[PDB]
């Protein structure tokens, strides 16, 4: 059993540069990863940093795909003009990666939707993967732009135009912001001046905690097909809040008494979500709890009972059994130079609720304001688009808002 990982863009392969560092440091159990990867980007600067880095010999030279020139924060450019010449080479490699494989669980894609490469050719890669395989799962861990913290200007245009394909192509989509992670590193990790490297290190922790069930034998294992049923009650509602516990420094960890009861609680407070949204406004549709390390089924069982009996958070009226647990034996590993201390046990929670319906509504106004005056539209239209797909992507998010409001009732 193996699962291969695709990384797109400046954000994608930097996340991968930390994720693969953790995989090699963690390791027959290796068979699911050893790498079965592909980096691809339009700007050669970040890929060729890997080609000369410490992991020169680790990656086969062909694997590291690199175009000639960047899409430059332009969804249309990275989806219609420049994507068309590189995407064919990428997926015609990924095929022979799958032919190397025999028991493919799925693919997992890493991209940020704000940019052009992460968004544009992300969706383009996804569309040819869906028509080629269809049944095989493709987990997409995307990075959406934050409400108030922002680096680009045209990112609302990109985020809406990317989402329109992220609905019906990916199977399980995990949101991740930058402000929420910045807040996590500021609050729990007490790092007052964080950079992208620290963000990517703890993103890898989440990925590792949800594939450790395939790699190592636990008391209750859970495959990628399991998330497919247990968390998405409707074919078009798959957008997951993420959380992790205990995110804790090296000194505080020894002082505190980490156990199963309190980390099940800590994984539920909005002070520890990976996406800037308040689930107090929403109702939980389903929750999924990956437990790693020193876990007996009793205290995880007792912990979900206390959550259900609390009234600070509510569930939908549909699910009395609104949980999916999972226990694995091997504890989480640490990276030298990393900030997370060694813990006997950790919890990665992936939920689904209606709080996500707020982020789309928040997104709508920013896109709406700019589009009404036709700001920046001339860049995308001359690239090959029209006014049709702007308006039609707009009404797709309008439908999604009504959808969440209907299901939440």
């Amino acid at each position: 059993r193996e699962v291969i990982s695709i990384h797109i863009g400046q954000a994608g392969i930097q996340v991968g540069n930390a994720c693969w560092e953790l995989y090699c440091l963690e390791h027959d159990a290796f068979n699911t990863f050893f790498p079965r990867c592909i980096f691809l980007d339009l700007e050669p600067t970040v890929v060729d940093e890997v080609r000369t880095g410490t992991y020169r010999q680790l990656f086969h030279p062909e694997q590291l795909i690199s175009g000639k020139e960047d899409a430059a924060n332009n969804f249309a450019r990275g989806h219609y003009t420049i994507g068309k010449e590189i995407v064919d080479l990428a997926l015609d490699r990924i095929r022979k990666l799958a032919d190397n494989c025999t028991g493919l669980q799925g693919f997992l894609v890493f991209n940020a939707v704000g940019g052009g490469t992460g968004s544009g050719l992300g969706s383009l890669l996804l569309e040819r993967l869906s028509v080629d395989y269809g049944k095989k799962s493709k987990l997409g861990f995307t990075v959406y732009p934050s409400p108030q913290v922002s680096t680009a200007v045209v990112e609302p245009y990109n985020s809406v135009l990317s989402t329109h394909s992220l609905l019906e192509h990916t199977d399980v989509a995990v949101m991740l912001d930058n402000e929420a992670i910045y807040d996590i590193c500021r609050r729990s990790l007490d790092i007052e001046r964080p950079t992208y490297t620290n963000l990517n290190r703890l993103i890898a922790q989440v990925i590792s905690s949800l594939t450790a069930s395939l790699r190592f034998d636990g008391a209750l294992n859970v495959d990628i097909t399991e998330f497919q049923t247990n968390l998405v009650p409707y074919p078009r509602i798959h957008f997951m809040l993420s959380s992790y516990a205990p995110i804790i420094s090296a000194e505080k960890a020894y002082h505190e008494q980490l156990s199963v009861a309190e980390i099940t609680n800590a994984a539920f407070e909005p002070a520890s979500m990976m996406v800037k949204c308040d689930p107090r406004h929403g109702k939980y549709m389903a929750c999924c709890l990956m437990y790693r390390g020193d876990v007996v089924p009793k205290d995880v069982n007792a912990s979900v009972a206390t959550i259900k009996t609390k009234r600070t958070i509510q569930f939908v009226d549909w699910c009395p059994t609104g949980f999916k647990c999972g226990i694995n034996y091997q504890p989480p590993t640490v990276v030298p130079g990393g900030d997370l201390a060694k813990v006997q046990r950790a919890v990665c929670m992936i939920s689904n609720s209606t709080a996500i319906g707020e982020i789309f509504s928040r997104l709508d106004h920013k896109f709406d304001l700019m589009y009404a005056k036709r700001a920046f539209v001339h860049w995308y239209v001359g690239e090959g688009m029209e006014e049709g797909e702007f308006s039609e992507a707009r009404e797709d998010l309008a439908a999604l808002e009504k959808d969440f409001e209907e299901v939440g009732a």
Binding site: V46, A72, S150, T151, E155, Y182, W379
Partner: protein, 426 residues
């Protein structure tokens, strides 16, 4: 990989470009004799963006000097970093225009523009993936403005997809060297609005004012002013030459700062800029760089941005810094000074971080604000232009060369409709 061909025109262009190639050659560690002598590995792998390996480690710049008077060429060849250019690239007329835009655009350009195009073509296809061209000229002179402007139009006809940067200085009445400044600048802008991709506006008032107030220089010759302009140009194309935590090429900045195709006149600033006596009395943090960036008395144009609103803004950072501090600082200035920014655009600031500082510094920054205060100069120019043209002063020096009255009226028309669209979007 990505390629930048350099083109310099006129006296202003040649001397600005001379100081430019001095600082770039030092950044890549190339000696005045043309051979590599740097220390870090990082300085080798991205010199093809600016140089060509000839033979025996001879790295010659990919530049084209262009003028009509030999004084500038000989002064270029005389000084250091003067023996690094290919003598075939010194394309050079002989008669001279002399602050007559008509000479540099219809009569004398007609016999030089053929030779420059031959050199720039052979120099363009010599490299594989062109990123764009980079022009440094003026709008007051004749052989800089007129010939350089005509060269911009011909280049955009041949290569319509490739990028185009123009560092152009504009005349102001407080520093007025020639008498026919309005006649030249108005006609030059008429061609810049339709031919260039983006124009980073400069001026001598702000440059002299900057060296007085902030730098506190005693005798600011053209060397120091050209040194400042070169530091801006190195900062704008540091992303191609060095790896960073967030990259932003030329096209990336262009699409994030230009919301409408005719709105491509920028203001520029460089930080940090401190007096030599106070260089050790200061920290080097991101907030300090931001306070000096958003100061209205720090733009390198004589147009106060607080007289209007910013449409967009850009900040290219260089150095080991935390991206969170970058975004928090940009958000902070976006909330406290809410009236100076446009409302129907949230996020008026694009940011980027490169990992290699300029030589000698720890952390630097470059600001490019596309504001609506730039329209004051166009009005500040058009009022002078009408003052002459109501009464046909100096007009015959251009009329007997080919321009008719409709050309000047067309230049007034384009200037007037432009200032109305900046006023519209404010």
């Amino acid at each position: 990989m990505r390629e930048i061909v350099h083109i310099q025109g006129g006296q202003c262009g040649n001397q600005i470009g001379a100081k430019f190639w001095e600082v770039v050659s030092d950044e890549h560690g190339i000696d005045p004799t043309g051979t590599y002598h740097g220390d870090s590995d990082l300085q080798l792998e991205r010199i093809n963006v600016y140089f060509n390996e000839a033979t025996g480690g001879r790295y010659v710049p990919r530049a084209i000097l262009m003028d009509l008077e030999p004084g500038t060429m000989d002064s270029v060849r005389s000084g250091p970093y003067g023996q690094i250019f290919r003598p075939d690239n010194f394309v050079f007329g002989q008669t001279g225009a002399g602050n007559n835009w008509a000479k540099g655009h219809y009569t004398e350009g007609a016999e030089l523009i053929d030779s420059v195009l031959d050199v720039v073509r052979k120099e363009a296809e010599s490299c594989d993936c062109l990123q764009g061209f980079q022009v440094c000229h003026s709008l007051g002179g004749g052989t800089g403005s007129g010939m350089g402007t005509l060269l911009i139009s011909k280049i955009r006809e041949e290569y319509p997809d490739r990028m185009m940067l123009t560092f152009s200085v504009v005349p102001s009445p407080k520093v007025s060297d020639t008498v026919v400044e309005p006649y030249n600048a108005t006609l030059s802008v008429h061609q810049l609005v339709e031919n260039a991709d983006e124009c980073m506006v400069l001026d001598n008032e702000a440059l002299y004012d900057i060296c007085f107030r902030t730098l506190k220089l005693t005798t600011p010759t053209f060397g120091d002013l050209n040194h400042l302009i070169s530091a801006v140009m190195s900062g704008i194309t540091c992303c191609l030459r060095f790896p960073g935590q967030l990259n932003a090429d030329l096209r990336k900045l262009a699409v994030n700062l230009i919301p409408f195709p005719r709105l491509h006149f920028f203001m520029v600033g460089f930080t940090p800029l401190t007096s030599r006596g106070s260089q050790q009395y200061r920290a080097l943090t991101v907030p300090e760089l931001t306070q000096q960036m958003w100061d209205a008395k720090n733009m390198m144009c004589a147009a106060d941005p607080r007289h209007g609103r910013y449409l967009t803004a850009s900040a290219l950072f260089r150095g080991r810094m935390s991206t969170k501090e970058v975004d928090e600082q940009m958000l902070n200035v976006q909330n406290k000074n809410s009236s100076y920014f446009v409302e129907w655009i949230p996020n008026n600031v694009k940011s980027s971080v490169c990992d290699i500082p300029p030589k000698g510094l720890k952390m630097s920054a470059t600001f490019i604000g596309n504001s609506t205060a730039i329209q004051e100069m166009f009005k500040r120019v058009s009022e002078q232009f009408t003052a002459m043209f109501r009464r046909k002063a100096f007009l015959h020096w251009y009329t007997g060369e080919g321009m008719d009255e409709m050309e000047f009226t067309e230049a007034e028309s384009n200037m007037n409709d432009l200032v109305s669209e900046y006023q519209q979007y404010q």
